[PDB]
Amino acid sequence: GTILIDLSPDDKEFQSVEEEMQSTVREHRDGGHAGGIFNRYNILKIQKVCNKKLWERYTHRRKEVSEENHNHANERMLFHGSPFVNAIIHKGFDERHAYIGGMFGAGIYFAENSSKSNQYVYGIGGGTGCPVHKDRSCYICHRQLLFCRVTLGKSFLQFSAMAHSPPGHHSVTGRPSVNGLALAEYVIYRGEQAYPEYLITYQIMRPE
């Protein structure tokens, strides 16, 4: 039931999504090991993901969470990188998209920094890099990230350097406590608490 609608680069929606992608790049403590060495992207395409059934599943859960949290869903737009993006846009998020070994337990992980989500496009730790060249810093191959609508509800704050949400909470927030330039990461434990709204196709750019 999924269709993908191409956005024009002249569309304000394309431009605001691209700006969020580009402006949330940062340097990573691995010196580029997992995601590659870059300061910006070449955005090739941005598609809107349209699936009525998946959207209704999201909004149903969002209403449940809102009602448990003084009419506040605490909805964010966050990045998700995964080798399973093609499954996710067709069938939705579920337990198979969880990071079993994540620092906040087995849940589905999202990032404010697009460059954090970029580290996971080819697998955990970048896997073995792109399928074609086996290069985690490949500047040729096309990569894809999701820009997702995510319901956090009442989020458990973890200060730091599928399972269940902590009791009385709907998500976990991983607050950076060492790297002053890192943005937060978030974990949900129910696939219905995210909708994969934009599919972004891109390359990382080699710095000059």
Ligand SMILES: Cc1ccc(-c2nc3c(C)cccc3c(=O)[nH]2)cc1
């Ligand atoms: C199988 C799989 C594991 C982790 C990810 C993933 N992890 C993230 C973490 C740990 C922090 C911030 C963002 C992400 C992310 O976008 N995907 C995606 C798929």
Ligand SMILES: [Zn+2]
């Ligand atoms: Zn490649």
